[PDB]
């Protein structure tokens, strides 16, 4: 599903908190080059909440399915999918529409 032409329309949305390019700097989030079918925590320069360690623990891979649940809400995401009650994401941001979500994954399919 998904116009990765559109998904990179609507990534600028993504823009003040991640980078795209491949070895582009961690600015608010974790840079996103190579994120597609990569694990949760993927980039080892990034200090993650220690929820994004454990669905790594967990052997969680960002497919399709789980970056459409999580970029729905994160927090309810990472809570899920963790199994710690106490867990915390930093991102927050939701993307709400169903055409953006799909859209957007298909771009990131694009970046490895
Ligand atoms: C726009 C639609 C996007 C998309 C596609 C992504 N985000 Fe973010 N994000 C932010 C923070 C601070 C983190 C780390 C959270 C923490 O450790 O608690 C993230 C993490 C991600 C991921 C997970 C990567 C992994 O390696 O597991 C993904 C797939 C992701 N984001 C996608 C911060 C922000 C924002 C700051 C306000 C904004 C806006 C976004 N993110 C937007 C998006």
């Known amino acids: 599903e998904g116009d990765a032409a559109a998904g990179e329309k ?3 949305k993504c823009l003040a908190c991640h980078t795209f390019d491949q ?3 961690n600015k608010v989030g974790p840079n996103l080059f190579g994120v597609f079918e990569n ?10 909440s220690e929820s994004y360690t454990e669905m ?3 052997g969680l891979t960002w497919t399709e399915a789980n970056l459409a649940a999580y ?5 309810a995401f990472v809570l899920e999918k963790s199994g710690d009650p106490k867990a915390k994401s930093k991102m927050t941001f939701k ?3 169903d055409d953006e979500i799909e859209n957007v ?4 399919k694009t970046l490895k």
Request: proline share 3%.
């Open 39 to 48: 694990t949760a925590a993927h980039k080892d320069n990034y200090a993650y």
């Open 56 to 58: 790594k623990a967990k």
């Open 105 to 108: 994954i298909a771009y990131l």
């Open 10 to 12: 609507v990534s600028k």
């Open 95 to 97: 993307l709400t529409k």
């Open 23 to 25: 070895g582009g700097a």
């Open 71 to 75: 970029v729905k809400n994160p927090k």
